[PDB]
Amino acid sequence: ETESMKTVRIREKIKKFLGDRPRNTAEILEHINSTMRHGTTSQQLGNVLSKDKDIVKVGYIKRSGILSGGYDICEWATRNWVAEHCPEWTE
């Protein structure tokens, strides 16, 4: 019922989802929100992903344009996935 309990539940779902390969924030949000009653927002999810040390940011695209407006897309992986697939990587 608590916000922490929800956040813990969300973290476990995200980690399972990211098991196979890295995914972008939009894909993660769609997955999470497809399997929870209320789910979360892209802003809140970004915070959760950043705060969870088991889930690491592996890429980014930022777009800006006089027509595009601006947006970012971030790519995330589990730390263990990175350790296994990029064994020269460190942070």
The CA-atom distances, in angstroms, between 71 and each of 9, 31, 51, 67, 68 are: 28, 20, 21, 12, 8
Number of residues that bind Cl ion (CB under 5 A): 3
- Asked if 38 is part of the footprint of Cl ion (rule: CB under 5 A), the reply reads yes
What is the β-pairing status of strands 55-65 and 69-78?
A: antiparallel
Instruction: Output the smallest distance, CB 71 to Cl ion, in A.
Output: 25
- Asked if 37 is part of the footprint of Cl ion (rule: CB under 5 A), the reply reads yes
Scanning 18-26, 28-36, 60-68, 83-91 for contacts with Cl ion by CB under 5 A, the matching segment is: 28-36
Interface with Cl ion (CB under 5 A)? 36-38
